[PDB]
Enzyme design. Structure first.
Site, mmCIF file in Angstrom:
data_model
loop_
_atom_site.group_PDB
_atom_site.id
_atom_site.type_symbol
_atom_site.label_atom_id
_atom_site.label_comp_id
_atom_site.label_asym_id
_atom_site.label_seq_id
_atom_site.Cartn_x
_atom_site.Cartn_y
_atom_site.Cartn_z
ATOM 1 N N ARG A 90 0.854 -1.173 0.000
ATOM 2 C CA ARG A 90 0.000 0.000 0.000
ATOM 3 C C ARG A 90 0.900 1.235 0.000
ATOM 4 N NH1 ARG A 90 -3.347 2.359 5.048
ATOM 5 N NH2 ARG A 90 -4.772 3.772 3.933
ATOM 6 N N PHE A 116 1.585 10.708 1.705
ATOM 7 C CA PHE A 116 0.992 10.180 2.951
ATOM 8 C C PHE A 116 1.967 9.194 3.570
ATOM 9 C CE2 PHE A 116 -2.611 7.307 4.838
ATOM 10 C CZ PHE A 116 -2.353 7.750 6.127
ATOM 11 N N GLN A 163 3.284 1.511 3.143
ATOM 12 C CA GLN A 163 2.961 0.517 4.159
ATOM 13 C C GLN A 163 3.317 -0.892 3.696
ATOM 14 O OE1 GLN A 163 -1.143 -1.428 6.213
ATOM 15 N NE2 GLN A 163 -1.032 0.719 5.621
#
Length: 182
Positions: free
Chosen positions: A58, A63, A66
């Site tokens: 991800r 941002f 992950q």
């Protein structure tokens, strides 16, 4: 005055089988010993058992990136050295800026193996995700991953793989600033 780095972990990263450099993370073993220990031991495990071979499944530019889902590769899997899940150890540290390491979760007390590296400051995550390390080297490698081509669902089009990982011991714990990683 910053939290002390007690341990290092490295990730040798590849995207679609092309090497893109090493990420080196400092772990706050005095602040969050139990969370730090989980991460360090998963970094030392062999593929299918830990971080080697797993991917950053991800990736969301501006941002975070992950990864750590070594059992399902998609965000639904993973497990800790303590069992499937373990409790939120403390929320002493915040997501101060790009380059901080924090546990992914599905709500209170659901830490597994999944983690993220922030690429911006993320105050809305403070108190909800346990922060436990800071990028020391290879923030450019993080940014390379951050900008990699994506598929819908925030998934890298090419697999972003932790080709190798391990733990470098630390001399003498050192304080780091509570600031974004440059």
């Amino acid at each position: 005055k910053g939290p002390k780095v007690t341990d290092r972990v490295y990730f040798d990263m590849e995207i679609g089988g092309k090497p893109i450099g090493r990420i080196v993370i400092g772990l706050f073993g005095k602040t969050v010993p139990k969370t730090a220990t989980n991460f360090i031991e998963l970094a030392k495990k062999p593929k299918g058992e830990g971080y080697p071979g797993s991917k950053f499944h991800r990736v969301i530019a501006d941002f975070m990136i992950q990864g750590g889902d070594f059992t399902r590769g998609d965000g639904t899997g993973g497990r800790s050295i303590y069992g499937e899940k373990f409790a939120d150890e403390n929320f002493k540290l915040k997501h101060y800026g790009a380059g901080w390491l924090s546990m992914a979760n599905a709500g209170a007390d659901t830490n597994g193996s999944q983690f993220f590296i922030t690429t911006v400051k993320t105050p809305w995550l403070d108190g909800r995700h346990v922060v436990f390390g800071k990028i020391l080297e290879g923030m450019d490698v993080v940014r390379k991953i951050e900008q990699t081509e994506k598929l819908p669902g925030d998934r890298p089009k090419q697999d972003v793989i932790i080709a190798a990982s391990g733990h470098i011991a630390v001399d003498t714990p050192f304080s780091v600033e509570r600031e974004a990683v440059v």
